[PDB]
Amino acid sequence: SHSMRYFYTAVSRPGRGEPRFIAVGYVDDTQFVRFDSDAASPRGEPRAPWVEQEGPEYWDRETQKYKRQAQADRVSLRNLRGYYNQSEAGSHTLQRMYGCDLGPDGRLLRGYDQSAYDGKDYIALNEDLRSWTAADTAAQITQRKWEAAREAEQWRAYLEGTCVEWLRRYLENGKETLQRAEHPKTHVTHHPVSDHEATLRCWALGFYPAEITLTWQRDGEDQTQDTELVETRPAGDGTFQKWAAVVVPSGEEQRYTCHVQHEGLPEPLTLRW
């Protein structure tokens, strides 16, 4: 399966100028666009090669969208303070994430849209793409505005149409990277801590997509509570890293095996020191 997902953040900064608006768009775990209202000449900018080739009409159009949405979010931040009677002296955040998921058949599996104010759920498009759920009485004001605008219809048309159509186009233009999972390069390192025990660290490097499972077993049994497992982190070149470590008694290293599951592996890997 595949997804296109957008992430919008608007953050006010009282006494330090207008609120900053940032938009990022991803296919799966690959960023392909960004807009930053603080940039020297704010525009939508490509972040992946498979949209660098869309032409000036595409880019200008996206740019216009982001510039107008930044303006709107600034008004929206003021509206939200009005609903809650919050002072202009405090900073606030508006977040919105929307996108579409495709199943193995290339068909829409689900579209979504959700907003948060200061980190709390505020309003969300329902699963039927025809109505909203408001989290509190301020968001019910927003819901009645969007209902009067009949905006859910515009979400349905986008999520079931445009979002799917353009996700499929990106997947095709970028298939040599987006549809070809890069398996983790793996190894085990050993770090004695005393004459009598040592850390075994199992490494997964340079993989894509980010989803992975890394576990240590002792004699074939799981070592969950004895494994230090870092969160998956970006290498910064589009691939990811992770490691898992266990502290083992000297001489007992052969009892331990590291197990790696990743979409780029034909079959799960078992590794040893």
Binding site: Y6, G25, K65, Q69, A72, S76, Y122, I123, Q154, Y158
Partner: peptide, 9 residues
């Protein structure tokens, strides 16, 4: 491809 401009909150 992004969503068109959305009504204000």
């Amino acid at each position: 491809m992004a969503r068109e401009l959305h009504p204000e909150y």
